[PDB]
CSV table of N, CA and C in Angstrom, one decimal:
chain,number,residue,atom,x,y,z
A,1,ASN,N,-10.3,19.3,13.1
A,1,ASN,CA,-11.5,18.5,13.0
A,1,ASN,C,-11.1,17.0,13.4
A,2,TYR,N,-12.1,16.1,13.2
A,2,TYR,CA,-11.9,14.7,13.5
A,2,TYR,C,-11.9,13.8,12.3
A,3,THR,N,-12.1,14.5,11.1
A,3,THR,CA,-12.1,13.7,9.9
A,3,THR,C,-11.1,14.5,9.0
A,4,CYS,N,-10.5,13.8,8.0
A,4,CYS,CA,-9.5,14.3,7.1
A,4,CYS,C,-10.1,14.6,5.8
A,5,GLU,N,-10.6,15.8,5.6
A,5,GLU,CA,-11.3,16.1,4.3
A,5,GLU,C,-10.3,16.6,3.3
A,6,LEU,N,-10.3,16.0,2.1
A,6,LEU,CA,-9.3,16.4,1.1
A,6,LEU,C,-10.0,16.9,-0.1
A,7,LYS,N,-9.7,18.1,-0.5
A,7,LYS,CA,-10.3,18.9,-1.6
A,7,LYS,C,-9.4,19.1,-2.8
A,8,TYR,N,-8.3,19.8,-2.6
A,8,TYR,CA,-7.3,20.1,-3.6
A,8,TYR,C,-5.9,19.8,-3.0
A,9,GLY,N,-5.0,19.4,-3.9
A,9,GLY,CA,-3.7,18.9,-3.6
A,9,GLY,C,-2.6,20.0,-3.5
B,1,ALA,N,11.5,-15.9,-20.6
B,1,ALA,CA,11.6,-16.4,-22.0
B,1,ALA,C,11.0,-15.4,-23.0
B,2,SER,N,9.6,-15.2,-22.8
B,2,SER,CA,8.9,-14.3,-23.7
B,2,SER,C,9.2,-12.8,-23.4
B,3,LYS,N,8.9,-11.9,-24.3
B,3,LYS,CA,9.2,-10.5,-24.1
B,3,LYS,C,8.4,-10.0,-22.8
B,4,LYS,N,7.2,-10.4,-22.7
B,4,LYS,CA,6.4,-10.0,-21.5
B,4,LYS,C,6.9,-10.7,-20.2
B,5,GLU,N,7.3,-11.9,-20.3
B,5,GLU,CA,7.9,-12.6,-19.2
B,5,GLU,C,9.2,-12.0,-18.7
B,6,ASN,N,10.0,-11.6,-19.6
B,6,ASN,CA,11.3,-10.9,-19.2
B,6,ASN,C,11.0,-9.6,-18.6
B,7,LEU,N,10.1,-8.8,-19.2
B,7,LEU,CA,9.8,-7.5,-18.6
B,7,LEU,C,9.3,-7.7,-17.2
B,8,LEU,N,8.4,-8.7,-16.9
B,8,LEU,CA,7.9,-8.9,-15.6
B,8,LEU,C,9.0,-9.2,-14.6
B,9,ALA,N,10.0,-10.1,-15.0
B,9,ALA,CA,11.1,-10.4,-14.1
B,9,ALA,C,12.0,-9.2,-13.8
B,10,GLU,N,12.2,-8.3,-14.8
B,10,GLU,CA,12.9,-7.1,-14.6
B,10,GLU,C,12.1,-6.2,-13.6
B,11,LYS,N,10.8,-6.1,-13.8
B,11,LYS,CA,10.0,-5.2,-13.0
B,11,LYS,C,10.1,-5.7,-11.5
B,12,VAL,N,10.0,-7.0,-11.3
B,12,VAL,CA,10.2,-7.5,-9.9
B,12,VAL,C,11.5,-7.3,-9.4
B,13,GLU,N,12.6,-7.4,-10.2
B,13,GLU,CA,13.9,-7.1,-9.7
B,13,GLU,C,14.0,-5.6,-9.3
B,14,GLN,N,13.4,-4.7,-10.0
B,14,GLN,CA,13.3,-3.3,-9.7
B,14,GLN,C,12.7,-3.1,-8.3
B,15,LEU,N,11.6,-3.8,-8.0
B,15,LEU,CA,10.9,-3.7,-6.7
B,15,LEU,C,11.8,-4.3,-5.6
B,16,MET,N,12.5,-5.4,-6.0
B,16,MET,CA,13.4,-5.9,-4.9
B,16,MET,C,14.6,-5.1,-4.6
B,17,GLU,N,15.1,-4.3,-5.6
B,17,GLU,CA,16.1,-3.3,-5.4
B,17,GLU,C,15.6,-2.2,-4.5
B,18,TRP,N,14.4,-1.7,-4.8
B,18,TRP,CA,13.7,-0.7,-3.9
B,18,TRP,C,13.6,-1.2,-2.5
B,19,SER,N,13.3,-2.5,-2.4
B,19,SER,CA,13.2,-3.2,-1.1
B,19,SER,C,14.5,-3.1,-0.2
B,20,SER,N,15.7,-3.0,-0.9
B,20,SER,CA,16.9,-2.9,-0.1
B,20,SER,C,17.0,-1.6,0.6
B,21,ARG,N,16.3,-0.5,0.1
B,21,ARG,CA,16.4,0.8,0.6
B,21,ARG,C,15.1,1.3,1.3
B,22,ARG,N,14.0,0.6,1.2
B,22,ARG,CA,12.7,0.9,1.8
B,22,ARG,C,12.0,-0.3,2.2
B,23,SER,N,11.2,-0.1,3.2
B,23,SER,CA,10.2,-1.2,3.6
B,23,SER,C,8.9,-0.9,3.0
B,24,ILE,N,8.6,0.5,2.7
B,24,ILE,CA,7.4,0.9,2.1
B,24,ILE,C,7.8,1.8,0.9
B,25,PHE,N,7.2,1.6,-0.2
B,25,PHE,CA,7.4,2.4,-1.4
B,25,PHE,C,6.5,3.6,-1.5
B,26,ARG,N,7.1,4.7,-1.4
B,26,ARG,CA,6.4,6.0,-1.5
B,26,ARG,C,6.1,6.4,-2.9
B,27,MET,N,4.9,6.4,-3.3
B,27,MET,CA,4.6,6.5,-4.8
B,27,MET,C,3.8,7.8,-5.1
B,28,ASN,N,4.1,8.4,-6.3
B,28,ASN,CA,3.3,9.3,-7.0
B,28,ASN,C,2.5,8.6,-8.0
B,29,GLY,N,1.8,9.3,-8.9
B,29,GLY,CA,0.9,8.7,-9.8
B,29,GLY,C,1.6,7.9,-10.8
B,30,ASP,N,2.8,8.4,-11.3
B,30,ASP,CA,3.6,7.6,-12.3
B,30,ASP,C,4.0,6.2,-11.8
B,31,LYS,N,4.6,6.2,-10.6
B,31,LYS,CA,5.0,5.0,-10.0
B,31,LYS,C,3.8,4.0,-9.6
B,32,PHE,N,2.8,4.6,-9.1
B,32,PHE,CA,1.6,3.9,-8.8
B,32,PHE,C,1.1,3.1,-10.1
B,33,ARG,N,1.0,3.9,-11.2
B,33,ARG,CA,0.5,3.3,-12.4
B,33,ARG,C,1.5,2.2,-12.9
B,34,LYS,N,2.8,2.5,-12.8
B,34,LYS,CA,3.8,1.6,-13.4
B,34,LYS,C,3.9,0.3,-12.6
B,35,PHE,N,3.8,0.4,-11.3
B,35,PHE,CA,4.1,-0.8,-10.4
B,35,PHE,C,2.8,-1.4,-9.8
B,36,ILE,N,1.7,-0.7,-9.9
B,36,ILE,CA,0.4,-1.3,-9.3
B,36,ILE,C,-0.7,-1.4,-10.3
B,37,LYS,N,-0.8,-0.5,-11.2
B,37,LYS,CA,-1.9,-0.6,-12.2
B,37,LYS,C,-1.5,-1.3,-13.5
B,38,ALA,N,-0.3,-1.1,-13.9
B,38,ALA,CA,0.1,-1.6,-15.2
B,38,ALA,C,0.3,-3.1,-15.2
B,39,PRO,N,-0.1,-3.9,-16.2
B,39,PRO,CA,0.2,-5.3,-16.4
B,39,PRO,C,1.6,-5.4,-17.0
B,40,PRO,N,2.2,-6.6,-16.9
B,40,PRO,CA,1.7,-7.7,-16.1
B,40,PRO,C,2.3,-7.6,-14.6
B,41,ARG,N,1.7,-8.4,-13.7
B,41,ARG,CA,2.2,-8.5,-12.4
B,41,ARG,C,2.0,-9.9,-11.9
B,42,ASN,N,2.9,-10.4,-11.0
B,42,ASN,CA,2.7,-11.7,-10.4
B,42,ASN,C,2.7,-11.6,-8.8
B,43,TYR,N,2.6,-10.4,-8.3
B,43,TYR,CA,2.8,-10.0,-6.9
B,43,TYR,C,1.5,-9.2,-6.5
B,44,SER,N,1.2,-9.3,-5.2
B,44,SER,CA,0.2,-8.5,-4.6
B,44,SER,C,0.8,-7.2,-4.1
B,45,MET,N,0.1,-6.1,-4.1
B,45,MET,CA,0.5,-4.8,-3.6
B,45,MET,C,-0.5,-4.4,-2.5
B,46,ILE,N,0.0,-4.1,-1.3
B,46,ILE,CA,-0.8,-3.4,-0.3
B,46,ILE,C,-0.4,-1.9,-0.4
B,47,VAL,N,-1.5,-1.1,-0.4
B,47,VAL,CA,-1.3,0.4,-0.5
B,47,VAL,C,-2.0,1.1,0.7
B,48,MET,N,-1.3,1.9,1.4
B,48,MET,CA,-1.9,2.9,2.3
B,48,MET,C,-2.0,4.2,1.6
B,49,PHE,N,-3.2,4.7,1.5
B,49,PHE,CA,-3.5,6.0,1.0
B,49,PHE,C,-3.6,6.9,2.2
B,50,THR,N,-2.9,8.0,2.2
B,50,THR,CA,-2.6,8.7,3.4
B,50,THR,C,-2.6,10.2,3.1
B,51,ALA,N,-2.6,11.0,4.2
B,51,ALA,CA,-2.4,12.5,4.0
B,51,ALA,C,-1.6,12.9,5.2
B,52,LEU,N,-0.3,12.9,5.1
B,52,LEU,CA,0.6,13.0,6.3
B,52,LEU,C,1.3,14.4,6.4
B,53,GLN,N,1.0,15.3,5.5
B,53,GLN,CA,1.6,16.6,5.5
B,53,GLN,C,1.1,17.3,6.8
B,54,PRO,N,2.1,18.0,7.5
B,54,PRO,CA,1.8,18.5,8.8
B,54,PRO,C,0.6,19.5,8.9
B,55,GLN,N,0.5,20.3,7.8
B,55,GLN,CA,-0.5,21.4,7.9
B,55,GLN,C,-1.9,20.9,7.8
B,56,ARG,N,-2.1,19.6,7.3
B,56,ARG,CA,-3.5,19.1,7.3
B,56,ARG,C,-3.9,18.6,8.6
B,57,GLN,N,-2.9,18.2,9.5
B,57,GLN,CA,-3.2,17.7,10.8
B,57,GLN,C,-4.1,16.5,10.9
B,58,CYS,N,-3.9,15.6,9.9
B,58,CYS,CA,-4.8,14.4,9.8
B,58,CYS,C,-4.3,13.4,10.8
B,59,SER,N,-4.8,13.4,12.0
B,59,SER,CA,-4.4,12.6,13.1
B,59,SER,C,-4.6,11.1,12.8
B,60,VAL,N,-5.7,10.7,12.2
B,60,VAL,CA,-5.9,9.3,11.8
B,60,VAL,C,-4.8,8.8,10.9
B,61,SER,N,-4.5,9.5,9.9
B,61,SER,CA,-3.5,9.2,9.0
B,61,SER,C,-2.2,9.0,9.7
B,62,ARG,N,-1.9,9.9,10.7
B,62,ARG,CA,-0.6,9.8,11.4
B,62,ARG,C,-0.5,8.5,12.2
B,63,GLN,N,-1.6,8.1,12.9
B,63,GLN,CA,-1.5,7.0,13.8
B,63,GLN,C,-1.5,5.7,12.9
B,64,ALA,N,-2.3,5.7,11.8
B,64,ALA,CA,-2.4,4.6,10.9
B,64,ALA,C,-1.0,4.3,10.2
B,65,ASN,N,-0.3,5.4,9.9
B,65,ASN,CA,1.0,5.2,9.3
B,65,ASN,C,2.0,4.6,10.3
B,66,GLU,N,1.8,4.9,11.6
B,66,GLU,CA,2.7,4.3,12.6
B,66,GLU,C,2.5,2.8,12.6
B,67,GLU,N,1.3,2.3,12.6
B,67,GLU,CA,0.9,0.9,12.5
B,67,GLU,C,1.4,0.2,11.2
B,68,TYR,N,1.2,0.9,10.1
B,68,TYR,CA,1.7,0.4,8.8
B,68,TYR,C,3.2,0.2,8.8
B,69,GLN,N,3.9,1.1,9.4
B,69,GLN,CA,5.4,1.0,9.6
B,69,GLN,C,5.8,-0.2,10.3
B,70,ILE,N,5.1,-0.5,11.4
B,70,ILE,CA,5.3,-1.7,12.2
B,70,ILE,C,5.0,-3.0,11.4
B,71,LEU,N,3.9,-3.0,10.7
B,71,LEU,CA,3.6,-4.0,9.8
B,71,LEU,C,4.7,-4.3,8.8
B,72,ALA,N,5.1,-3.3,8.0
B,72,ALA,CA,6.0,-3.5,6.9
B,72,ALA,C,7.4,-3.8,7.4
B,73,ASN,N,7.7,-3.4,8.7
B,73,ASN,CA,8.9,-3.8,9.3
B,73,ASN,C,8.9,-5.3,9.7
B,74,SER,N,7.7,-5.8,10.2
B,74,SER,CA,7.5,-7.2,10.5
B,74,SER,C,7.7,-8.0,9.3
B,75,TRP,N,7.2,-7.5,8.1
B,75,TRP,CA,7.4,-8.2,6.8
B,75,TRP,C,8.8,-8.4,6.5
B,76,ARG,N,9.5,-7.2,6.5
B,76,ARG,CA,10.9,-7.2,6.2
B,76,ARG,C,11.8,-8.3,6.9
B,77,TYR,N,11.5,-8.5,8.2
B,77,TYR,CA,12.2,-9.5,9.0
B,77,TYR,C,11.6,-10.9,9.0
B,78,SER,N,10.4,-11.0,8.3
B,78,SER,CA,9.7,-12.3,8.3
B,78,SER,C,10.5,-13.4,7.6
B,79,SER,N,10.4,-14.6,8.2
B,79,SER,CA,10.9,-15.8,7.4
B,79,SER,C,10.0,-16.0,6.2
B,80,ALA,N,8.8,-15.4,6.1
B,80,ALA,CA,7.9,-15.5,5.0
B,80,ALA,C,8.2,-14.4,3.9
B,81,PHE,N,9.2,-13.6,4.2
B,81,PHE,CA,9.5,-12.5,3.2
B,81,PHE,C,9.7,-13.1,1.8
B,82,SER,N,9.2,-12.4,0.8
B,82,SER,CA,9.3,-12.8,-0.6
B,82,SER,C,9.1,-11.7,-1.5
B,83,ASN,N,9.3,-12.0,-2.8
B,83,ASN,CA,9.0,-11.0,-3.9
B,83,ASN,C,7.6,-11.1,-4.4
B,84,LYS,N,6.7,-11.6,-3.7
B,84,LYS,CA,5.3,-11.9,-4.1
B,84,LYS,C,4.3,-10.9,-3.4
B,85,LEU,N,4.8,-10.0,-2.5
B,85,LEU,CA,4.0,-9.1,-1.8
B,85,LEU,C,4.9,-7.9,-1.5
B,86,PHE,N,4.4,-6.7,-1.7
B,86,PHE,CA,5.0,-5.4,-1.4
B,86,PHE,C,4.1,-4.4,-0.7
B,87,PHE,N,4.7,-3.5,0.0
B,87,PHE,CA,3.9,-2.4,0.7
B,87,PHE,C,4.3,-1.0,0.0
B,88,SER,N,3.2,-0.3,-0.3
B,88,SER,CA,3.4,1.1,-0.8
B,88,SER,C,2.5,2.1,0.0
B,89,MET,N,2.8,3.3,-0.2
B,89,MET,CA,1.9,4.4,0.3
B,89,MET,C,1.8,5.4,-0.8
B,90,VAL,N,0.6,6.1,-0.8
B,90,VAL,CA,0.4,7.2,-1.7
B,90,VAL,C,-0.2,8.3,-0.8
B,91,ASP,N,0.6,9.4,-0.7
B,91,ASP,CA,0.1,10.6,0.0
B,91,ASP,C,-0.7,11.5,-0.9
B,92,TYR,N,-1.8,12.0,-0.4
B,92,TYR,CA,-2.7,12.8,-1.1
B,92,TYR,C,-2.0,14.0,-1.9
B,93,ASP,N,-1.1,14.6,-1.2
B,93,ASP,CA,-0.4,15.8,-1.8
B,93,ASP,C,0.6,15.5,-2.8
B,94,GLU,N,1.0,14.2,-3.0
B,94,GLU,CA,1.9,13.8,-4.0
B,94,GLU,C,1.3,12.9,-5.1
B,95,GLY,N,0.2,12.3,-4.8
B,95,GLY,CA,-0.5,11.5,-5.7
B,95,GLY,C,-2.0,11.8,-5.8
B,96,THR,N,-2.3,13.1,-5.9
B,96,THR,CA,-3.6,13.6,-6.0
B,96,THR,C,-4.4,13.0,-7.1
B,97,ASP,N,-3.7,12.8,-8.2
B,97,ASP,CA,-4.3,12.2,-9.4
B,97,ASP,C,-4.8,10.7,-9.1
B,98,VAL,N,-4.1,10.0,-8.2
B,98,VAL,CA,-4.5,8.7,-7.9
B,98,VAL,C,-5.7,8.7,-7.0
B,99,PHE,N,-5.8,9.7,-6.1
B,99,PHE,CA,-7.0,9.8,-5.2
B,99,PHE,C,-8.2,10.0,-6.1
B,100,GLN,N,-8.1,10.9,-7.1
B,100,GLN,CA,-9.2,11.2,-7.9
B,100,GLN,C,-9.6,10.1,-8.8
B,101,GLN,N,-8.7,9.3,-9.3
B,101,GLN,CA,-9.0,8.1,-10.1
B,101,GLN,C,-9.8,7.1,-9.3
B,102,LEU,N,-9.5,7.0,-8.0
B,102,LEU,CA,-10.1,6.1,-7.1
B,102,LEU,C,-11.2,6.7,-6.3
B,103,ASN,N,-11.6,8.0,-6.6
B,103,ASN,CA,-12.7,8.6,-6.0
B,103,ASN,C,-12.6,8.7,-4.5
B,104,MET,N,-11.4,9.0,-4.0
B,104,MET,CA,-11.1,9.1,-2.6
B,104,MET,C,-11.1,10.6,-2.2
B,105,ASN,N,-12.0,11.0,-1.3
B,105,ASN,CA,-12.1,12.4,-0.8
B,105,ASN,C,-11.6,12.5,0.7
B,106,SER,N,-11.0,11.4,1.2
B,106,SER,CA,-10.5,11.4,2.5
B,106,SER,C,-9.4,10.3,2.7
B,107,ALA,N,-8.8,10.3,3.8
B,107,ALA,CA,-7.7,9.4,4.2
B,107,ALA,C,-7.9,9.0,5.6
B,108,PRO,N,-7.3,7.9,6.0
B,108,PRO,CA,-6.6,6.9,5.2
B,108,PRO,C,-7.4,5.8,4.8
B,109,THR,N,-6.9,5.0,3.8
B,109,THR,CA,-7.5,3.8,3.3
B,109,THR,C,-6.4,2.8,3.0
B,110,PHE,N,-6.7,1.6,3.4
B,110,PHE,CA,-5.7,0.5,3.1
B,110,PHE,C,-6.4,-0.4,2.0
B,111,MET,N,-5.8,-0.7,0.9
B,111,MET,CA,-6.3,-1.5,-0.1
B,111,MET,C,-5.2,-2.6,-0.6
B,112,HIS,N,-5.8,-3.7,-1.1
B,112,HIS,CA,-4.9,-4.8,-1.7
B,112,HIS,C,-5.2,-4.8,-3.1
B,113,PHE,N,-4.1,-4.7,-3.9
B,113,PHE,CA,-4.3,-4.8,-5.4
B,113,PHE,C,-3.7,-6.2,-5.8
B,114,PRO,N,-4.6,-7.1,-6.2
B,114,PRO,CA,-4.1,-8.4,-6.6
B,114,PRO,C,-3.3,-8.4,-7.9
B,115,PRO,N,-2.5,-9.4,-8.1
B,115,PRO,CA,-1.8,-9.4,-9.4
B,115,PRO,C,-2.7,-9.5,-10.6
B,116,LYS,N,-3.8,-10.2,-10.5
B,116,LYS,CA,-4.7,-10.3,-11.6
B,116,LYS,C,-6.0,-9.6,-11.2
B,117,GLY,N,-6.7,-9.0,-12.2
B,117,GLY,CA,-8.0,-8.4,-12.0
B,117,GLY,C,-7.9,-7.2,-11.1
B,118,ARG,N,-9.1,-6.7,-10.7
B,118,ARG,CA,-9.1,-5.5,-9.9
B,118,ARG,C,-9.4,-5.9,-8.4
B,119,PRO,N,-9.3,-4.9,-7.5
B,119,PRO,CA,-9.6,-5.2,-6.1
B,119,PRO,C,-11.1,-5.6,-6.0
B,120,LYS,N,-11.3,-6.5,-5.1
B,120,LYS,CA,-12.6,-7.0,-4.8
B,120,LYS,C,-13.1,-6.2,-3.5
B,121,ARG,N,-14.4,-6.5,-3.2
B,121,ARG,CA,-15.0,-5.8,-2.1
B,121,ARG,C,-14.1,-5.9,-0.8
B,122,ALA,N,-13.6,-7.1,-0.5
B,122,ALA,CA,-12.8,-7.3,0.7
B,122,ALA,C,-11.4,-6.8,0.6
B,123,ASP,N,-11.0,-6.4,-0.6
B,123,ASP,CA,-9.7,-5.8,-0.8
B,123,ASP,C,-9.6,-4.3,-0.3
B,124,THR,N,-10.6,-3.8,0.2
B,124,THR,CA,-10.6,-2.6,1.0
B,124,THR,C,-10.7,-2.9,2.5
B,125,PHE,N,-9.7,-2.7,3.3
B,125,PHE,CA,-9.7,-3.0,4.7
B,125,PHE,C,-10.8,-2.2,5.4
B,126,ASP,N,-11.5,-2.8,6.4
B,126,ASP,CA,-12.7,-2.2,7.0
B,126,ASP,C,-12.2,-1.4,8.2
B,127,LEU,N,-11.5,-0.3,8.0
B,127,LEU,CA,-10.9,0.5,9.1
B,127,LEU,C,-11.9,1.0,10.1
B,128,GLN,N,-13.0,1.4,9.6
B,128,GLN,CA,-14.1,2.1,10.3
B,128,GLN,C,-14.7,1.1,11.3
B,129,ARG,N,-14.6,-0.2,11.0
B,129,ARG,CA,-15.1,-1.2,11.9
B,129,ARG,C,-14.1,-1.7,12.9
B,130,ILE,N,-12.8,-1.9,12.4
B,130,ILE,CA,-11.8,-2.7,13.0
B,130,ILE,C,-10.7,-1.9,13.7
B,131,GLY,N,-10.5,-0.7,13.3
B,131,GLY,CA,-9.3,0.1,13.7
B,131,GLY,C,-8.1,-0.4,12.8
B,132,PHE,N,-6.9,0.1,13.2
B,132,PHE,CA,-5.8,-0.1,12.3
B,132,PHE,C,-4.6,-0.7,13.0
B,133,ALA,N,-4.8,-1.4,14.1
B,133,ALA,CA,-3.7,-2.1,14.7
B,133,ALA,C,-3.0,-2.9,13.7
B,134,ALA,N,-1.6,-3.0,13.7
B,134,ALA,CA,-0.9,-3.8,12.8
B,134,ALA,C,-1.4,-5.2,12.7
B,135,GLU,N,-1.7,-5.8,13.9
B,135,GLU,CA,-2.2,-7.2,13.9
B,135,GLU,C,-3.4,-7.4,13.1
B,136,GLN,N,-4.3,-6.4,13.1
B,136,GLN,CA,-5.5,-6.5,12.4
B,136,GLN,C,-5.3,-6.3,10.9
B,137,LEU,N,-4.4,-5.4,10.5
B,137,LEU,CA,-4.0,-5.3,9.1
B,137,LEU,C,-3.4,-6.6,8.6
B,138,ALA,N,-2.6,-7.3,9.5
B,138,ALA,CA,-2.0,-8.5,9.1
B,138,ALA,C,-3.0,-9.6,8.9
B,139,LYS,N,-4.0,-9.6,9.8
B,139,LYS,CA,-5.1,-10.6,9.6
B,139,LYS,C,-5.8,-10.4,8.2
B,140,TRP,N,-6.0,-9.2,7.9
B,140,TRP,CA,-6.7,-8.9,6.6
B,140,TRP,C,-5.8,-9.3,5.4
B,141,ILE,N,-4.5,-8.9,5.5
B,141,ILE,CA,-3.6,-9.3,4.5
B,141,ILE,C,-3.5,-10.9,4.3
B,142,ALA,N,-3.5,-11.6,5.4
B,142,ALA,CA,-3.6,-13.1,5.4
B,142,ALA,C,-4.8,-13.6,4.6
B,143,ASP,N,-6.0,-13.0,5.0
B,143,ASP,CA,-7.2,-13.3,4.3
B,143,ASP,C,-7.2,-13.1,2.8
B,144,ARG,N,-6.5,-12.0,2.4
B,144,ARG,CA,-6.6,-11.6,1.0
B,144,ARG,C,-5.5,-12.3,0.1
B,145,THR,N,-4.4,-12.7,0.8
B,145,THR,CA,-3.2,-13.1,0.0
B,145,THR,C,-2.6,-14.5,0.5
B,146,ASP,N,-3.1,-14.9,1.6
B,146,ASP,CA,-2.6,-16.1,2.3
B,146,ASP,C,-1.1,-16.0,2.8
B,147,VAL,N,-0.6,-14.7,2.8
B,147,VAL,CA,0.7,-14.4,3.4
B,147,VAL,C,0.4,-14.1,4.9
B,148,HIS,N,1.1,-14.7,5.8
B,148,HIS,CA,0.8,-14.5,7.2
B,148,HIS,C,2.0,-13.7,7.8
B,149,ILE,N,1.8,-12.4,8.1
B,149,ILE,CA,2.9,-11.6,8.7
B,149,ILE,C,2.6,-11.6,10.2
B,150,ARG,N,3.6,-12.1,10.9
B,150,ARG,CA,3.5,-12.1,12.4
B,150,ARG,C,4.1,-10.8,13.0
B,151,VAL,N,3.3,-10.0,13.5
B,151,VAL,CA,3.7,-8.6,13.9
B,151,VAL,C,4.6,-8.7,15.2
B,152,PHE,N,5.6,-7.9,15.2
B,152,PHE,CA,6.4,-7.7,16.4
B,152,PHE,C,6.7,-6.2,16.6
B,153,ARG,N,6.8,-5.8,17.9
B,153,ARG,CA,7.2,-4.5,18.2
B,153,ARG,C,8.4,-4.5,19.2
């Protein structure tokens, strides 16, 4: 993608 | 002299010893809390919140880190170098608890944590408007701290 989506580590 | 004054001086010495081995302090939540959140402090902290693990393929974080490296290297060699300003990074996969405390659901973000009080509106770098050239980061740092880091590559 073009965005860095952060959900769980 | 005082108990709190002596602890502060020791804490700064610890950061200066870290400085001999790193230009940027890589922090987990414990270190973040100890060196950036906890009082007292007499130094400013710049922090890059990032997600650099290869599997995430966060291209922005990667490029931004390259600039941040150039910046922190410029600092290291600066005639303005001092114990009043430090550079840290917090990676999402190592400081997940920090991202959650700060309500961050993406990366990267550059923030200034002043020695007193909490970060102000302008203490979040406006990456989405400006980009992340080291020279622009340096401009922002100067605006927030009056420390002028002259970038070189």
